[PDB]
Design a protein around this nucleic acid. Structure first.
Ligand SMILES: [K+]
Ligand SMILES: [K+]
Ligand SMILES: [K+]
Ligand SMILES: [Mg+2]
Ligand SMILES: [Mg+2]
Ligand SMILES: [Mg+2]
Ligand SMILES: [Mg+2]
Ligand SMILES: [Mg+2]
Ligand SMILES: [Mg+2]
Ligand SMILES: [Mg+2]
Ligand SMILES: [Mg+2]
Ligand SMILES: [Mg+2]
Ligand SMILES: [Mg+2]
Ligand SMILES: [Mg+2]
Ligand SMILES: [Mg+2]
Lengths: 202, 252, 56, 78, 85
RNA sequence: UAGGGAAUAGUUUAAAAAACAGCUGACUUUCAAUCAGCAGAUGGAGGUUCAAUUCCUCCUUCCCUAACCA
RNA sequence: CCGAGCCUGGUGAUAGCUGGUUGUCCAAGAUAGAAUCUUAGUUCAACUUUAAAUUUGCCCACAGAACCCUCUAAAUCCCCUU
RNA sequence: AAUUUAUUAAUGCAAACAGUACCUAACAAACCCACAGGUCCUAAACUACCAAACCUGCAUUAAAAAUUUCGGUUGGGGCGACCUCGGAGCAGAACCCAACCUCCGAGCAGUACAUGCUAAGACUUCACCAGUCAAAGCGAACUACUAUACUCAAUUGAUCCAAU
């Protein structure tokens, strides 16, 4: 929006009268064009799940382009009006205490999708005798797959693993979804050696 | 303030960071900022990783410090090497120092203070005509004219007044070097300083004290309150990832 | 219209009163320090040149 | 407050003035004695040089430089 | 439709100048009418619709002098007639 | 005028060095080139520091950028 | 009557330029200059006209007003009296 | 020639509108490990690309035009010359006095730093504007540098506005 102001003063008209406009009062200066202003975010309440944010009832501040051109037209989100906030707020209470079941958080859904399609390379050193336990296996998610897994969540095959081979790790994400990821125990190779050996070679 | 250098300083400050583990039990690292802070917990955690990742109980903790070594004024400071011994020097033994002093009583003071290589023309000629390696060099003003021969050989590593390595009193760097540990500087001058602090087996409190000593040691170059000298601190073991310490309380 | 041999400068009182007067000096010579009467304090005080007004 | 600060500033600046004048007066006398020294020395050296060579930038520059060196050599000894 | 001074200096030439709004074709859905409309709008209209929490609220809340559109007033009569009946 | 930046041998650069010029010569018919030597500098002033091109300050000259309206 | 048509309107365009400006009778009444895109005009002085106030105006005796330089000019200024 | 780019075209930015990819140069000196490889002497940190047009706003460069003016003096005008200020002659003796008349100059410099303040009475370039000289007084200076409105002939520029 173009906002303008007059160069010349307009004489006061008084109460109940229209201003007397000379032709000099048509000369304007551009005060501001509001399209050049810093863009503000649009506050929406989500309905379905989206990769960025997916917790139904989560107050999200998105770019006006995203909300207007995708979320709102398709119904994935609704306006954060006082009436909508009340309805979604009430539903939250029921989920916490009522019959309504609890649902993954925004990050929980992202991890579950990643955990469904990933394989862990549990690199173990040959020299030192090693026994695989939840704590050690948890460390490899951080290093290899980049997932930060709590030690208690991991459920190992319960058979002591001291030999290179394949097994299965059952990961529980926030206590609701249990994912079983393939486990590939392999001889440990240092980061520099492994990258130079294969990544550089091929 | 060159755009690239100053912009990165703004960018590194921008990197978000958070306190405490997120509510979610299992969370992708990408989804949340850096979290681990406290220096005490950091050392305790580095010991934990050593057990999980089977490795030597004693490892060099190569603390890397992204210390704002620039932007005092719009003119940036320069990289130097303030050498000071930590409260508990780790078990590494380093005693490599060359002292240039010819036909002077300083020859005695040099060796008396633990000089490894002390000599005059004979020592200077040996450096030019034959290969020899020393960690740091010192020379008295009287020998600087003769020592100029090795200026080209040492590629600006020869003694300079800027590094306080030219003076009648040699023990500035000579004496403190053996117990002292050099605060080397980056080659790219990106402001990250790789400086070992302690062995992994050193007690947390001793490593914590060793950390604080360096904080004052590093600010010695520019201890002015005009420009902040410290931005981030990554305490990493030899075979572990760096952890973002909460160094703000320990800065002053 | 001719070679600029002199310049006009502002002499500021050292008494802190802020009284100023303009004097002409040679461009090449050093900054003037003069003993000039200051009306605010009503006695002669040392003045020191601070700025160059214009070229004469 | 503004009035009190201005009067205090003037009073302080005016208590130092008596000594300032003494220093200024001495500088004038010192400058009078320095100009005489220059008037004498520069003229003699420059005049003799000009008479010999050419009956004068090069010669003047030399004498205007060596004299400075002599003063510096004394400062180096200090 | 107005005038301007060249270089924003009153002592310079006075020139004619027209400032036009940036126009966009967007699709909106009306709950009361259960129909989608492709309408030319400005970024201001989109902001006003967001502040009203939907097209229907914007059409019903906005007075005639602020809508400044015969089509907008036709939508209002349509929406009001469905609510009245 | 305004701030920013800059000032090194006669000249142009470097972190107190090299290159050219001046070259004193040698050698080329002549001259260039080439070889070996020799002279050569930290704009000016003041101060700190044992020591300041390398810390600071004022002034001169020049550049840059923006003025240079009435 | 095209160096850019014609008509109406703005329009009683503007013109320091030219022309014109209507009954009777009497009276006073001519002229240093300055500035100005100003010298075909203006504004201020000067002159001129009317009314009012109160007091000198004009004509002029002595005495008096420069050296430097050549015409040692005709004269002027000042000025009581009358 | 001065002023201008609204208009037209081009270019840049913003506005508007998709997503796409997330980065590898060991090497054991010693020791371990049947291998494949590991322990020590660092295995950190770090996201980067990035949406064609039309339209709208703001800039820049062009094109094509628009608006307005084109000083005076002058033995007619043009050309040449001249245009403000001071000294001398013409103008012999109070003042004043012209020519595209006759001659010479000025657009500073130097010394002070009370070239501080204030105030009777006067002069005046024929108006106005501007310009000029000043007793006393205040404050200084002073113990006789022809001293307290510097020397100098002209040595210069109104109002608005701008900088402070
Ligand atoms: K006229
Ligand atoms: K006629
Ligand atoms: K004639
Ligand atoms: Mg016709
Ligand atoms: Mg008419
Ligand atoms: Mg008559
Ligand atoms: Mg004029
Ligand atoms: Mg006339
Ligand atoms: Mg009489
Ligand atoms: Mg003109
Ligand atoms: Mg004419
Ligand atoms: Mg003629
Ligand atoms: Mg002419
Ligand atoms: Mg007069
Ligand atoms: Mg007097």
């Amino acid at each position: 929006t173009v906002i303008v102001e007059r160069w010349w003063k307009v004489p006061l008209a008084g109460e109940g009268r229209k201003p007397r406009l000379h032709r000099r009062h048509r000369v304007y200066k551009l005060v501001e064009d509001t399209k050049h202003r810093p863009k503000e975010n649009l506050e929406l309440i989500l309905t379905q799940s989206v990769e960025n944010v997916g917790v139904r009832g989560d107050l999200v501040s998105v770019k006006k382009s995203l909300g207007r051109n995708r979320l709102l037209p398709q119904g994935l989100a609704v306006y954060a009006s006082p009436e909508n906030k009340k309805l979604f707020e009430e539903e939250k209470l029921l989920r916490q205490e009522g019959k309504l079941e609890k649902i993954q958080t925004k990050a929980g859904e992202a991890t579950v999708k990643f955990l469904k399609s990933c394989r862990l390379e549990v690199g173990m050193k040959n020299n030192v005798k090693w026994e695989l336990n939840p704590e050690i296996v948890a460390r490899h998610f951080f290093k290899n797959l980049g997932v930060v897994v709590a030690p208690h969540t991991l459920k190992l095959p319960e058979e002591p693993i001291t030999r290179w081979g394949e097994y299965w790790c059952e990961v529980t994400v926030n206590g609701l979804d249990t994912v079983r990821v393939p486990m590939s125990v392999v001889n440990f190779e240092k980061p520099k050696t492994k990258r130079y050996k294969y990544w550089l070679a091929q | 303030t060159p755009d690239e250098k100053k912009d990165e300083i703004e960018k590194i400050k921008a990197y978000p960071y958070m306190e405490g583990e997120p509510e979610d039990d299992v969370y992708l690292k990408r989804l949340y900022p850096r979290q681990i802070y406290e220096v005490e917990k950091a050392v305790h955690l580095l010991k934990k990783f050593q057990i999980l990742d089977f490795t030597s109980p004693k490892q060099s903790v190569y603390l890397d410090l992204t210390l704002d070594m620039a932007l005092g004024k719009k003119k940036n400071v320069e990289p130097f090497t303030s050498v000071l011994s930590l409260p508990y020097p780790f078990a590494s033994e380093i005693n490599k120092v060359a002292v240039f002093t010819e036909n002077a009583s300083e020859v005695k003071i040099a060796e008396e203070n633990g000089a490894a290589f002390a000599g005059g023309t004979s020592l200077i000629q040996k450096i030019w005509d034959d290969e020899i390696v020393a960690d740091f060099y010192v020379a008295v003003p009287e020998i600087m004219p003769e020592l100029n021969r090795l200026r080209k050989k040492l590629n600006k590593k020869y003694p300079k007044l800027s590094r306080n390595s030219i003076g009648r009193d040699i023990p500035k760097m000579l004496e403190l070097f053996k117990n002292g540990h050099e605060i080397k500087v980056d080659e790219e001058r990106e402001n990250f300083l790789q400086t070992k602090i302690a062995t992994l087996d050193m007690s947390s409190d001793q490593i914590a004290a060793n950390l604080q000593a360096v904080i004052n040691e590093v600010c010695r170059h520019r201890p002015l309150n005009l420009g902040p000298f410290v931005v981030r601190a990554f305490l990493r073991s030899s075979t572990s990832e760096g952890l973002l310490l909460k160094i703000d309380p320990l800065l002053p | 219209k001719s070679k600029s041999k002199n310049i006009l400068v502002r002499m500021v009182s050292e008494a802190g009163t802020g009284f100023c007067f303009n004097t002409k000096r040679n461009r090449l010579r050093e900054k003037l320090t003069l003993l000039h009467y200051d009306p605010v304090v009503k006695q002669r005080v040392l003045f020191v040149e601070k700025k160059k007004i214009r070229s004469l | 407050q503004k009035r009190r600060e201005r009067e205090q500033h003037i009073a302080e600046c005016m208590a130092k003035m008596p000594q300032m004048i003494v220093n200024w007066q001495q500088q004038q006398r010192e400058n009078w004695e320095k100009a005489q020294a220059d008037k004498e020395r520069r003229a003699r050296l420059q005049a003799e040089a000009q008479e010999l060579l050419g009956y004068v930038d090069p010669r003047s520059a030399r004498f205007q430089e060596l004299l400075q060196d002599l003063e510096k050599k004394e400062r180096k000894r200090l | 439709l107005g005038q301007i001074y060249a270089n924003n200096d009153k002592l310079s030439k006075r020139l004619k100048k027209v400032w036009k709004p940036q126009l966009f074709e967007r699709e909106f859905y009306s709950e009361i009418l259960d129909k989608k409309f492709t309408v030319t709008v400005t970024m201001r209209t989109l902001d006003l619709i967001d502040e009203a929490y939907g097209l229907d609220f914007y059409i019903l809340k906005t007075p005639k002098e602020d809508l400044c559109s015969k089509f907008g007033m036709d939508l209002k009569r349509g929406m009001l007639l469905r609510l009245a009946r």
